[PDB]
Design an enzyme around this catalytic site. Structure first.
Site, PDB file in Angstrom:
ATOM      1  N   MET A   1       0.940  -1.073   0.245  1.00  0.00           N
ATOM      2  CA  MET A   1      -0.054  -0.012  -0.245  1.00  0.00           C
ATOM      3  C   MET A   1       1.135   1.402  -0.207  1.00  0.00           C
ATOM      4  SD  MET A   1      -3.179  -1.426   2.828  1.00  0.00           S
ATOM      5  CE  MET A   1      -3.692  -2.375   2.462  1.00  0.00           C
ATOM      6  N   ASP A   2       0.974   2.387  -1.216  1.00  0.00           N
ATOM      7  CA  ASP A   2       1.454   3.411  -1.290  1.00  0.00           C
ATOM      8  C   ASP A   2       0.169   4.332   0.335  1.00  0.00           C
ATOM      9  OD1 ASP A   2      -0.793   4.192  -2.514  1.00  0.00           O
ATOM     10  OD2 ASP A   2       0.330   4.070  -4.610  1.00  0.00           O
ATOM     11  N   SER A   3       0.891   5.385  -0.258  1.00  0.00           N
ATOM     12  CA  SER A   3       0.757   6.764   0.980  1.00  0.00           C
ATOM     13  C   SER A   3      -0.987   6.880   1.061  1.00  0.00           C
ATOM     14  CB  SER A   3       0.688   8.344   0.558  1.00  0.00           C
ATOM     15  OG  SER A   3       2.352   8.197   0.770  1.00  0.00           O
TER      16      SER A   3
END
Ligand SMILES: CCCCCCCCCCCCCCCCCC(=O)OC[C@H](COP(=O)(O)OCCN)OC(=O)CCCCCCCCCCCCCCCCC
Ligand SMILES: CCCCCCCCCCCCCCCCCC(=O)OC[C@H](COP(=O)(O)OCCN)OC(=O)CCCCCCCCCCCCCCCCC
Ligand SMILES: CCCCCCCCCCCCCCCCCC(=O)OC[C@H](COP(=O)(O)OCCN)OC(=O)CCCCCCCCCCCCCCCCC
Ligand SMILES: CCCCCCCCCCCCCCCCCC(=O)OC[C@H](COP(=O)(O)OCCN)OC(=O)CCCCCCCCCCCCCCCCC
Ligand SMILES: CCCCCCCCCCCC(=O)OC[C@H](COP(=O)(O)OCC[N+](C)(C)C)OC(=O)CCCCCCCCCCC
Ligand SMILES: CCCCCCCCCCCC(=O)OC[C@H](COP(=O)(O)OCC[N+](C)(C)C)OC(=O)CCCCCCCCCCC
Ligand SMILES: CCCCCCCCCCCC(=O)OC[C@H](COP(=O)(O)OCC[N+](C)(C)C)OC(=O)CCCCCCCCCCC
Lengths: 95, 80, 60, 130, 118, 169, 506, 70, 108, 161, 105
Positions: A41-43
């Site tokens: 998961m990115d930001s």
């Protein structure tokens, strides 16, 4: 009445299902499962998950905790320690 | 129908609805007093009926104040 | 006087790391209030679509 | 300012300061056994609650309810025209006033720059129009 | 007479029946506040007049005023009765219920056509 | 899978009753948790049929997990403000044990009534008992489903419990 | 005197400024008012003159030597209770300031004392309903005197609702009797005692049974006594029983004229259930006030057996039992209020929360009382042994006199059941004593500087500072020695109870 | 609003006296005054306690500006 | 039973009402077993009383234990048989003791 | 046709299906009105008017408390009931309206005989006041005492100060 | 001795005399027991409810049914509507069946 009825196994189980509905690399989620590495998961994806886990358990992560969260187990720890049932009207309890 | 306590379904699900049931139940006693006093042509029964009405109104006010303060206690933060 | 509800004092942030945290906190607030937006404004779409719209604006 | 654990947009967990002594109670028992022997079943026993609601530090999650918010909007005889005065009332007591204006903002200052000094004069007739 | 008019007070507050109109709701609160104000005074004034004739028949009270009109012995009560009447009818200077400058139309803000006429 | 399907019907029925009569909230969490693990169980055992014994080991794992969690909390404290997490774990164990004891399998005494003659007969033929691994050998782990009516794991627990009683070292 | 002085106190309290000292001094004025009320009442009412029964106020009231004794008992116990709010119970402001923060505390007590004393005297159905409302309303206002307390207000809501249902039952019973006979005066109704429906009077008793917390209506009183502040629970758990039980005795005296055994069986059913609940109910409890609530339910069942038998031996049993039980009730709550000074302070598991209203809330907060204060611990042991019925304490003669009246009337089952009930309830009475003393030796040499009492300062380090205030200590000493040494004067006291007559004469 | 009910009952309690003033004579008149004198203590009580005011939630207090000089 | 089902339908989102209704709720086997146990008790108590020309403590002990065992075998099916007999002996003894003591009062 | 029977039939129907607190404060008014009218037309017109004078003032105070305590709970909640179970319940209830079982007292009609001895003829309220202010004056003075206690009681409960 | 059974005009009502004779009997010093006052108690209760008298009317109505007697031939004539208490029913010499005025006396 105004006390939690949460167990560590239920909170983990509900956390996994809510995380399963996302686009994660693996469906094998446990306490040690990290968000960045294992699930990927990115930001923005991470904060979508946090709010999704907020709605499931009716809890609100504080800003300090949310920015610093790494693992799935940290979420389960947070829910168990901070969950409170919502106050009911003056009639729900005594009647 | 009375012996299976059908009146327990007719009472609403708020604390104030219990107050209304009490007023209605007491009002049944006064109607019975007025009915008997009028048939007998007895003013002592009507004096009793008048006393019941005044007294029943007193407990209605005392109970309301308790419920009023109970609601204030819940709305206690009052940061405004 | 007092500020209106949900008002923040204006401050010029001089640290990119501190700015990034403030953006992420605000992005969470948009997501949390998404169901409120559907309620108040009587939208014809689910809150899930509202959260998707929020992410697009942050992704721009 | 900042979403914290005990205070956020949607609810708060308010605890007052403890006026009384922090009394310590240990070894709770009944006449049939210790507390831990029946604590599994004590959830159904109201007389077995160890947390008292009168304690200043009793945890209560209270939803943040909007105060009574009234639009003293443009369609109102009190407002001398178009004023969306937003009042947060406690009954009828004013707690916060948010005058919303611009319902009669017509860009007079912008339009004046496009006019000569003689042409811009009638614009002033229409600012304070009494 | 007193009992019948008290029912009209109840019928006014029914308009704000969990209504979503905040001006109707704000007006219902003021109707109760005015009722508490005038009801005791108006009832007690009429009871003093009934006490002077020792009757609760309106016709007997009128015929008891052959040799004297109660305006002379009870001039203070006539003012108080009229002040109470203004408060009962929500008429100015006690028009706090239907205050146009405050609550647009009070309890009538949502009423149109036949419900408004009645 | 006749017994498995009948068993999962009662769990579903108790969920319908719980929502209907507003029974204990914690029970709603238990049944909802059982169904999710059943959902995982169906995926990983397709076409293999589902005997109640495989369901027995599923509820056994849930009971053992919460007992381990309860042990830590009842020693170092529950994390919630009202300190009810540790007792909530044990309350769920009772709900899961209610369904576990309703399956048509052997009780703890029936399984012990068959392993105890084996544990004793091992010790008398050999003198000293060191590990349970010498008792697993004399167990027919192929036909203990209709002569004993037990799962693969419930026999394991019975031996381990009996071994700790009978061990000489 | 009560009515006249109440009006002056009502006005005076609203005139002077609000301060803790002024409220405390106003409470002492209430103490003087009750003392003068007792002196005036003693000066004019005597047992020998009131034996016949004297009507007052157009026969609305009827005072006899049985009613008069209870009135004096009510005044005496009310004197002892006011000492709690008129003097220091602990001496520490964090605890004692609660008793001085409500100026209407003394006013409500004087309101309730008037209702308590008039209720046994009622001689008309109209005045029976009026007075039972006057007593009930004051109890609700006292239960809610601490309106900033969530539990205190919640109890008053429960108290109001249950007590209004009972009052409607009481009113419904009197309306039925008036409908039958068209009469309102009790003595007039006695002329038709053989023709009215006697179960119309059982409905009247049922409403009275709710107000004394009898089973099956015991649930609300156990809940209310545990949630209320200890100072409030001390009053409301005892005072209503002194008057209502006396009124129940007079009503049962009239009921026994027609000798309806079906009515005797229904009451015996309620007594039997209350013994079972009173004894088994307290076995698994952790709160001291919940434990005492079941003790109250059990001792009421014992008295109701004497009231049910309703004979010459019953007057002596009820009169003696009610006096000695009131003193034991006063003594126990006095000690519980005092011993909050020995509570340890933190500096945690189970998250136990203790409030200022009820510092002593659990039975195990009485731990090591044998070490902290041996004289007070013994005083508490003597009181608990009296509730058990250990001879020759006052509680033994109470059970002995109750058994005599019960067995004389053929109540074999209830006499056996209460003695079994006494043995069962001994289990939770002994648990108090186990907590007080049983760990004395394994804890004698320990350093306990973390008590509430240790927060108090010291004056000069050369003076002797008593650890408990003068008045509250003398009351505990006096009541404990009365309970212990009643054998000395038991013969003279029981001869006095022989003279208390309720239309016996000859 | 709550105190309206006790006073409303007091006013309604004078109705029996209105139509029987002559019959009761001086005895009823004195009793009528005693009925009103006991209720006038409630009026004194409400005046002295200021219980018939408006329960505002805000309070405007004037702080004094002071300087801790050195 | 059907009156309480109405109270259920009227409200199921209120925990306070639901908790109180669950205490008074009777299972299906209790709705049948209770009338049968009480009916058998009344029949056997009168039947034995007719046999003995009067009521005896032994007759009431027999009538109560049998009536209890009949009811227990209906609404306590999922318990061992010896457990139901243990309760039935205990229940029968209580009523035999009740008769031995002269019911609620010796009377005459 | 005694139309009061129909009025109570409708009122019993609405008491079974009532959901929120506003409907309960309307069941009260829907109960006093049949009482007032039936007292007016059958037994006592004096007490029909006393009921209206006192209960209405209590009703409005009751209504104003609903405004301050209404808490969103029962507008969005669901009830099940069932139309068939409601009407069947009301049918079974309507079957038995004999509050008394003395058949002769309920069936045989009676009369009274007038006399001319009462030449001083005044209303029931004058006799009620005559007795209340002379013979039962103690009852009146205790009622005055109870009304005073309520005034003090309401203040010590509600007033924060 | 407080007043009981007071009529609507302040004096004794219909049943006061029965009640007064009961009190006098019960409180008389010439009576050994309350047996002499038992008939006086029944008379007072009969004055209020007339239960025995209503019971007698029940027997007469029932006994007339079993012998076939017509209710309208052995009873008393009656009128149910007040407006039709006409002069013809009242028996006046110039009677008529037109309705009487009851709107305003
Ligand atoms: C203050 C204590 C005064 C005691 C007075 C007791 C009393 O009321 O008199 C005895 C009473 C009979 O009185 P009687 O014959 O009717 O009238 C003339 C008698 N002079 O007989 C009675 O009916 C009295 C019934 C109640 C008795 C209660 C006994 C109380 C025991 C003493 C209380 C403890 C004292 C603690 C000291 C604290 C003060 C520092
Ligand atoms: C028609 C509705 C049902 C009838 C209810 C009757 C209520 C009044 C009767 C008096 C009892 C008052 C006690 C409080 C009332 C109990 C309320 C109730 O009925 O709840 C049932 C209660 C809960 O039990 P539970 O099985 O866990 O809940 C049901 C789960 N579906 O289960 C209980 O614990 C009830 C038992 C309470 C204890 C009562 C014991 C009284 C003494 C009986 C034995 C007498 C001793 C002498 C015996 C010798 C003579 C034979
Ligand atoms: C559960 C069953 C366990 C035993 C139940 C009671 C057995 C003890 C007993 O006394 O049995 C006798 C019983 C009938 O009792 P009884 O009244 O004595 O019969 C008439 C005699 N002429 O006879 C029986 O039917 C049993
Ligand atoms: C001048 C006539 C005034 C009345 C005309 C209107 C007729 C409606 C019923 C009047 C009273 C009949 C009995 C009703 C008792 C209160 C029960 C109630 O909740 O009100 C019924 C009304 C209908 O709402 P409905 O949609 O049918 O049901 C809810 C569906 N979820 O739900 C409502 O909340 C609407 C209520 C509006 C306010 C009514 C206030 C009561 C007025 C009563 C005055 C007459 C006294 C009763 C006479 C009839 C007795 C049955
Ligand atoms: C105050 C002004 C009204 C006023 O004074 O009105 C009262 C007076 C005087 O009438 P009175 O003495 O009350 O009796 C009334 C006598 N009639 C019946 C003749 C009017 O009426 C007027 O002179 C007009
Ligand atoms: C014993 C003989 C009794 C006399 C009978 C009459 C009693 C009247 C009492 C008035 C007192 C008063 O006006 O009170 C004023 C009060 C509150 O005023 P405040 O805040 O205290 O300021 C004033 C105090 N000063 C000045 C001392 C500082 O409100 C008002 O402005 C009420 C205005 C009422 C006007 C209603 C119009 C009626 C018109 C009638 C046409 C026929
Ligand atoms: C131990 C005492 C038992 C007595 C024997 C008895 O009572 O015997 C058992 C009785 C039999 O009585 P029966 O068969 O009805 O009468 C016998 C035949 N007759 C009619 C000719 C007399 O029955 C029961 O189970 C009753 C239970 C009794 C329990 C008593 C508890 C102890 C109380 C202590 C009192 C101080």
């Amino acid at each position: 009445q105004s006390a939690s009825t949460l167990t560590k196994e239920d909170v983990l189980t509900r956390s996994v299902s809510v995380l399963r509905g996302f686009e994660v690399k693996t469906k094998d989620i446990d306490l040690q499962t990290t968000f960045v590495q294992d699930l990927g998961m990115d930001s923005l994806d991470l904060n979508d998950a946090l709010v999704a886990l907020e709605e499931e358990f009716d809890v609100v992560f504080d800003d300090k905790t949310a920015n610093e969260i790494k693992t799935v187990g940290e979420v389960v720890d947070f829910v168990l320690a901070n969950y409170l049932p919502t106050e009911q009207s003056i009639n729900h309890t005594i009647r | 129908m009375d012996l299976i306590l059908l009146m327990l379904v007719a009472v609403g699900l708020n604390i104030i609805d219990i107050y209304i049931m009490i007023e209605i139940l007491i009002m049944g006693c006064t109607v019975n007093t007025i009915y008997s006093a009028s048939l007998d042509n007895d003013m002592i029964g009507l004096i009793y009926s008048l006393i019941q009405i005044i007294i029943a109104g007193v407990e209605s006010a005392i109970g309301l104040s308790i419920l009023v303060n109970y609601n204030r206690i819940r709305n206690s933060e009052e940061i405004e | 006087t007092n500020p209106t509800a949900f008002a923040q004092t204006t401050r010029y942030v001089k640290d990119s790391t501190e700015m990034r945290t403030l953006v992420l906190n605000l992005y969470r607030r948009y997501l949390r209030h998404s169901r409120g937006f559907v309620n108040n404004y009587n939208l014809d779409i689910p809150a899930s679509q509202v959260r998707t719209k929020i992410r697009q604006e942050f992704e721009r | 300012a900042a979403q914290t654990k005990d205070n956020n947009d949607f609810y708060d967990v308010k605890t007052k300061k403890n006026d009384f002594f922090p009394v310590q109670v240990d070894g709770i028992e009944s006449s049939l056994g210790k507390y831990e022997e029946f604590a599994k079943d004590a959830h159904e026993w109201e007389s077995w609650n160890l947390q008292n609601e009168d304690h200043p530090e009793y945890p209560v999650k209270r939803t943040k309810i909007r105060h009574f918010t009234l639009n003293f909007g443009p369609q109102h005889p009190a407002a001398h025209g178009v004023l969306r005065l937003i009042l947060e009332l406690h009954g009828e007591e004013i707690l916060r006033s948010d005058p919303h204006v611009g319902l009669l903002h017509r860009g007079t200052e912008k339009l004046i720059e496009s006019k000569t000094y003689m042409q811009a004069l009638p614009y002033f007739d229409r600012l304070d129009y009494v | 007479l007193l009992a019948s008019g008290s029912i009209g007070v109840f019928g006014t507050v029914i308009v704000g029946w969990m209504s979503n109109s905040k001006y109707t709701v704000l007006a219902t609160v003021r109707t109760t506040a005015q009722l508490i104000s005038y009801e005791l005074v108006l009832t007690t004034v009429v009871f003093i007049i009934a006490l002077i004739v020792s009757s609760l028949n309106i016709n007997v009270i009128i015929e008891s005023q052959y040799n004297i009109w109660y305006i002379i012995p009870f001039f203070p009560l006539c003012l108080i009765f009229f002040i109470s009447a203004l408060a009962e009818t929500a008429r100015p200077p006690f028009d706090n219920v239907e205050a146009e400058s405050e609550l647009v139309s009070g309890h009538m803000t949502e009423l149109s056509a036949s419900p408004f006429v009645i | 899978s006749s017994a498995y399907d009948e068993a999962l019907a009662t769990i579903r029925n108790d969920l319908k009753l719980n929502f209907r009569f507003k029974a204990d909230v914690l029970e709603k969490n238990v049944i909802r948790s059982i169904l999710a693990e059943t959902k995982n169980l169906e995926i990983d055992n397709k076409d293999k049929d589902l005997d109640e014994f495989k369901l027995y080991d599923l509820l056994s794992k849930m009971i053992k997990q919460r007992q381990d969690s309860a042990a830590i909390y009842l020693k170092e404290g529950s994390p919630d403000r009202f300190r009810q997490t540790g007792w909530n774990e044990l309350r769920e164990v009772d709900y899961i044990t209610k369904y576990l004891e309703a399956l048509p399998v052997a009780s703890a005494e029936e399984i012990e009534a068959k392993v105890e003659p084996i544990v004793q007969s091992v010790l008398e033929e050999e003198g000293e008992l060191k590990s349970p691994k010498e008792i697993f050998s004399r167990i027919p782990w192929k036909v203990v489903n209709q002569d004993w009516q037990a799962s693969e794991g419930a026999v394991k627990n019975t031996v381990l419990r009996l071994y700790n009683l009978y061990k000489t070292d | 005197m009560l009515f006249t002085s109440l009006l002056l106190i009502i006005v005076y309290g609203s005139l002077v400024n609000k301060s803790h000292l002024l409220t405390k001094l106003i409470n002492r004025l209430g103490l003087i008012i009750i003392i003068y009320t007792l002196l005036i009442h003693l000066n004019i009412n005597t047992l020998e003159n009131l034996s016949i029964g004297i009507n007052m106020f157009n026969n609305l009231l009827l005072i006899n030597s049985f009613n008069n004794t209870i009135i004096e008992l009510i005044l005496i116990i009310c004197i002892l209770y006011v000492l709690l709010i008129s003097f220091n119970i602990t001496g520490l402001s964090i605890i004692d300031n609660l008793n001085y923060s409500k100026r209407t505390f003394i006013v409500i007590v004087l309101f309730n004392i008037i209702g308590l004393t008039l209720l046994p005297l009622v001689n008309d159905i109209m005045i029976l309903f009026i007075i039972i409302e006057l007593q009930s309303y004051s109890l609700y206002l006292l239960t809610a005197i601490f309106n900033e307390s969530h539990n205190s207000t919640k109890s008053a809501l429960y108290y109001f609702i249950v007590g209004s249902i009972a009052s409607f039952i009481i009113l419904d019973a009197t309306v039925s009797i008036y409908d039958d006979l068209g009469l309102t005066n009790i003595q007039y109704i006695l002329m038709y005692i053989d023709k009215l429906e006697i179960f119309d009077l059982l409905c009247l008793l049922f409403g009275l049974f709710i107000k004394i917390g009898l089973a099956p209506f015991y649930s609300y009183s156990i809940t209310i006594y545990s949630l209320s502040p200890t100072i409030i629970t001390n009053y409301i758990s005892l005072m209503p029983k002194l008057s209502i039980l006396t009124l129940i005795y007079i009503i049962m005296h009239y009921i026994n004229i027609v000798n309806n055994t079906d009515l005797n069986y229904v009451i015996s059913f309620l007594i039997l259930i209350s013994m079972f609940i009173g004894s088994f109910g307290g076995l698994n409890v952790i709160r001291i006030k919940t434990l005492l609530a079941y003790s109250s339910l059990l001792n009421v069942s014992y008295m109701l057996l004497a009231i049910l038998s309703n004979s010459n031996e019953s007057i002596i049993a009820y009169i003696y039992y009610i006096i000695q039980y009131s003193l034991t009730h006063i003594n126990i709550f006095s000690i519980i209020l005092v011993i909050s000074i020995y509570l340890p302070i933190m500096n945690n598991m189970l998250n136990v929360m203790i409030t200022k209203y009820s510092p002593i809330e659990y039975i195990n907060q009485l731990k090591n009382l044998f070490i902290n204060n041996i004289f007070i611990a013994i005083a508490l042991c003597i009181s608990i042994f009296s509730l058990i019925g250990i001879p020759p304490l006052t509680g033994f003669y109470g059970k002995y006199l109750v058994l005599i009246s019960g067995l004389n009337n053929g109540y074999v089952l209830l006499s056996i059941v209460l003695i079994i009930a006494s043995s069962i309830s001994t289990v939770y009475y002994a648990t108090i004593l186990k907590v007080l003393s049983f760990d004395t030796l394994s804890f004698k040499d320990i350093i306990s500087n973390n008590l509430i009492i240790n927060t108090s300062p010291e004056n000069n380090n050369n003076e002797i500072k008593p650890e408990i205030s003068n008045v509250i200590s003398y009351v505990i000493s006096s009541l404990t020695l009365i309970i212990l040494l009643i054998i000395i004067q038991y013969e003279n006291i029981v001869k006095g109870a022989y003279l208390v007559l309720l239309y016996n004469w000859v | 609003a709550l105190l309206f009910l006790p006073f409303d009952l007091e006013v309604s309690s004078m109705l029996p006296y209105i139509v029987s003033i002559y019959s009761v004579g001086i005895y009823g008149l004195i009793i009528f005054i005693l009925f009103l004198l006991i209720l006038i203590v409630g009026f004194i009580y409400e005046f002295n306690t200021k219980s018939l005011s408006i329960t505002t939630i805000l309070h405007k207090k004037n702080k004094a500006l002071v300087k801790n000089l050195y | 039973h059907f009156r309480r089902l109405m109270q259920y339908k009227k409200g199921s989102a209120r925990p306070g009402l639901a908790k109180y209704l669950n205490l008074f709720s009777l299972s299906k086997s209790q709705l049948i077993g209770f009338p049968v146990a009480l009916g058998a008790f009344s029949f056997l108590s009168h039947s034995f009383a007719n046999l003995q020309e009067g009521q005896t403590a032994t007759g009431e002990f027999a009538a109560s234990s049998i009536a209890s065992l009949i009811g227990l075998s209906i609404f306590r099916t999922k318990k061992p048989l010896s457990s139901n007999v243990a309760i039935a002996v205990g229940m029968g003894s209580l009523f035999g003791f009740l008769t031995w003591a002269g019911n609620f009062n010796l009377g005459d | 046709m005694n139309l009061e029977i129909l009025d109570l039939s409708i009122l019993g129907f609405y008491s079974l299906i009532s959901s929120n607190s506003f409907e309960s404060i309307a069941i009260l008014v829907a109960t006093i009105m049949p009482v007032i009218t039936e007292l007016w037309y059958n037994y006592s017109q004096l007490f029909a008017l006393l009921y209206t004078l006192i209960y209405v003032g209590a009703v409005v105070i009751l209504f104003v408390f609903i405004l301050s305590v209404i808490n969103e709970k029962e507008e969005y909640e669901y009830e099940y009931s069932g139309l068939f179970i409601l009407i069947l319940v009301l049918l079974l209830d309507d079957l038995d309206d004999n509050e008394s079982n003395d058949n002769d007292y309920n069936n045989v009609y009676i009369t009274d005989y007038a006399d001319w001895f009462n030449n001083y003829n005044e209303s029931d309220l004058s006799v009620i006041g005559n007795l209340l202010f002379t013979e039962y004056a103690l009852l009146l003075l205790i009622i005055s005492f109870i009304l005073l206690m309520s005034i003090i009681g309401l203040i010590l409960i509600v007033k924060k100060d | 001795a407080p007043l009981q059974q007071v009529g609507r005009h302040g004096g004794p009502n219909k049943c006061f005399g029965e009640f007064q004779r009961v009190v006098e009997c019960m409180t008389n010093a010439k009576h050994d027991s309350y047996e002499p006052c038992n008939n006086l108690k029944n008379d007072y209760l009969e004055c209020r409810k007339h239960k025995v008298e209503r019971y007698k009317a029940f027997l007469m109505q029932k006994h007339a049914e079993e012998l076939g007697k017509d209710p309208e031939e052995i009873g008393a004539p009656f009128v149910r509507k007040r407006r039709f208490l006409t002069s013809k029913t009242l028996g006046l010499v110039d009677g008529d069946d037109y309705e009487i005025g009851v709107e305003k006396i």
